[PDB]
Amino acid sequence: YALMVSNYLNWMVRNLADMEIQLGAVKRIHALLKTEAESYEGLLAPSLIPKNWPGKIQIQNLSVRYDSSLKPVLKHVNALISPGQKIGICGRTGSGKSSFSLAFFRMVDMFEGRIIIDGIDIAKLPLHTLRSRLSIILQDPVLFSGTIRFNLDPEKKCSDSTLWEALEIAQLKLVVKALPGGLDAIITEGGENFSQGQRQLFCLARAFVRKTSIFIMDEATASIDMATENILQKVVMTAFADRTVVTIAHRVHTILSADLVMVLKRGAILEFDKPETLLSQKDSVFASFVRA
């Protein structure tokens, strides 16, 4: 045993050093486990929520942040939106107009204000129910690996025949029917087998599949060429007629046809009226946006 002690000592010390090096990994795992979690329960009673959900949206003294210790990107935002009408949001880059779209999904700190949608505040509502009944499209098209069934309706809540017309709206049915897999064509990582505009049109049909009236179009036209942008916009307007379209757009020429245009400067609503009367004024900032 005394002969074996000399081996056992260095075995113990080397394995102890390796053990502490490897326990650093589980320390990092628990440190990432200590990240705070958003509440998904919802203060509103699940049975009190109606079976179907939206297009009217009421905004009362909204002001949102990203952190508690941060300057508010929006300051005392207050606006009423009629059901079914089309809203074109514009503002200078750096005025925090992008957070206005995220305010409807409770992804920003609503430290004051209240978003009343069809008589129901979103803050009381669960996050899953809120984010399951609102449509939204961002700058870049994020396509996930799998079939067009998985990209368009991953939960398989809608039938395939319901998916066919949804794909028809995006004008990609020629490509998808021409694809070797039929509708079972495999999208690669990020949709590298499609062009950029094609991926964005995929995202549009993906948003149509949920079939809600509130359709938020957060600067989808910015990354897409104008020729595809025009046919995309007209098929959006036809596909979402009864649907309420709140369009956050970086360029005002797209939202020239909206019912109302909101102009944001440093988190404040300068102008809330129709584009015709707004463009009538020479000193209006939206007129400067259109001219420049």
CB 89 within 8 A of CB 265: no
Tell me the C-alpha to C-alpha distance, in Å, between residue 110 and each of 115, 128, 259: 9, 18, 27
Calpha distance 194→281 (Å, rounded):
44
Method of elucidation: cryo-EM
Residues at the binding site are 66, 94-99, 192, 195, 197
Where the chain is discontinuous (C–N > 2.5 Å), the residues before each break are 54
- In angstroms, the first-to-last Cα distance of the chain is 89
Q: Phi and psi of 272, rounded to 5°? A: -135, 85
Helix (H, G, I), strand (E, B) or coil at 147: strand
CB 222 within 8 A of CB 213: no
Neighbours of 237 (CB within 10 A): 14
Which residues make beta-bridge pairs with 117?
Answer: 120
Strands (E), the chain: 57-65, 77-81, 86-91, 109-117, 120-121, 135-137, 146-147, 186-187, 215-218, 245-248, 260-265, 268-273
Residues at the binding site for ATP are 195, 197
CB 208 within 8 A of CB 236: no
Resolution (A): 2.9
The residue with tokens 């949206």 is 57
- Which letter does DSSP use for residue 285 in this model? H
Calpha distance 123→99 (Å, rounded):
16
* CA atoms within 13 A of residue 287's CA, in its CB half-sphere: 9
The letter for the amino acid at 45 is A
- Dihedral angle sign, alpha carbons of residues 257, 165, 199, 52: positive
Residues at the binding site for ADP are 66, 94-99, 192, 195
Which residues make beta-bridge pairs with 269?
Answer: 264
Q: Residues 6 or more apart from 164 whose CB is under 8 A from it? A: 173, 183
Calpha distance 271→260 (Å, rounded):
10
Secondary structure of 198-253 in the HEC alphabet?
Answer: HHHHHHHHHHHCCCCCCEEEECCCCCCCHHHHHHHHHHHHHHCCCCCEEEECCCCC
